[PDB]
Design a protein around this ligand. Structure first.
Ligand SMILES: Brc1ccc2nn[nH]c2c1Br
Ligand SMILES: Brc1ccc2nn[nH]c2c1Br
Ligand code: NA
Length: 333
């Protein structure tokens, strides 16, 4: 007997109610620009896989960011373009400005409106309590928007959050793993970086939704308020679930397994063992106590649930008491 089917609790049918062309990215017709409008200035430090550059638009002298889409399926390129076009102008969403190909190389590139190469990872272990709440709220605006637009990001992590801390501006970047949510669709579980992978990915439950992003956000929040990077520090994808099980406990894990009739990979049998659900107080110490409050712990607890259906939505998260002072100060200013 197969796994039990699942639906998103929110924004379940938004793509069904759209015209086919909104989400049918394989049939999207891209008018490919010319690279000659742009001059690359310097390579942005994004590690070994990346080809991201600061560039100049020659015509207007405006600074842009260029991402060279190194060889991968045509299908993945049209998916990222269509998602960026659909989300263009959304709150805290990076703005796609142009789509170009090398005249000779024929390699496709995305041009984005300029942001400083200063990610949340470089800032997010040195912020005040108020600033963690502020930036988390800004990330939730981007996630509620993309979820409301029928899209899951699937790669929420500090490296994909660009922050201009002087202007208190944030952008959610790298939509290369993002997908359209369709009720009943079984998705690839080989998404997200190890430390941010939701339990659904680790146990191979394919009928996941927007709630995957809310697990990743919880992992980010835990690492920031406890100053523990990453929070769930697995050796590999198998040990990753063990690190979660040692915190969330094994009772709720096996109840989740039972509820969705998930066939657990046999490897897990020897390694998961039996663990109590730990009180969050265990992670609190003298160097992180100024970031931890009852409000923060209540909010974190409601994000980090095995059962994806149980997790706060982005909109429910934005209504949590943890953000009351952020919401007040936003209206006031
Ligand atoms: Br936009 C762009 C994209 C790729 C490029 N490679 N050489 N110069 C390039 C420019 Br300008
Ligand atoms: Br900055 C920036 C802006 C948009 C991006 N999309 N993928 N990677 C990106 C980077 Br790095
Ligand atoms: Na405290």
């Amino acid at each position: 007997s197969g796994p039990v089917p699942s639906r998103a609790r929110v924004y379940t049918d938004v793509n069904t109610h759209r015209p086919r062309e909104y989400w049918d990215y394989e049939s999207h017709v891209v008018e490919w620009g010319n690279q000659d409008d742009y001059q690359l200035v310097r390579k942005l430090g994004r590690g070994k896989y990346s080809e991201v550059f600061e560039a100049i638009n020659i015509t207007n002298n405006e600074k842009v960011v260029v991402k060279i889409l190194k060889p991968v399926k045509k299908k993945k390129i049209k998916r990222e373009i269509k998602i960026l076009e659909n989300l263009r102008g959304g709150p805290n969403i990076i703005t796609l400005a142009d789509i170009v190909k090398d005249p000779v190389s024929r390699t496709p590139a995305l041009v984005f409106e300029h942001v400083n190469n200063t990610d949340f990872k470089q800032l997010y272990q040195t912020l005040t309590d108020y600033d963690i709440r502020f930036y988390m709220y800004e990330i939730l605006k981007a996630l509620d928007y993309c979820h409301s637009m029928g899209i899951m990001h699937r790669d929420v992590k500090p490296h994909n959050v660009m922050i201009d801390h002087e202007h208190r501006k944030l952008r959610l970047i790298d939509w290369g793993l993002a997908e359209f949510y369709h009720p009943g669709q079984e998705y690839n579980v080989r998404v997200a970086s190890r430390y941010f992978k939701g339990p659904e990915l680790l146990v191979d439950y394919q009928m996941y939704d927007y709630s995957l992003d809310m697990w990743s956000l919880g992992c980010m929040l835990a690492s920031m308020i406890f100053r523990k990077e990453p929070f769930f520090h697995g050796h590999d994808n198998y040990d990753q679930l063990v690190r979660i099980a040692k915190v969330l406990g094994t009772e709720d894990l096996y109840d989740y397994i039972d509820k969705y009739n998930i066939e657990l990979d046999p490897r897990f049998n020897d390694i998961l063992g039996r663990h109590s659900r730990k009180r969050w107080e265990r992670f609190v110490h003298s160097e992180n106590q100024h970031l931890v409050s009852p409000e923060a712990l209540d909010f974190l607890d409601k994000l980090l649930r095995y059962d994806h259906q149980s997790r706060l939505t982005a909109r429910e998260a934005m209504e949590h008491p943890y953000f009351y002072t952020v919401v007040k100060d936003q209206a006031r200013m």
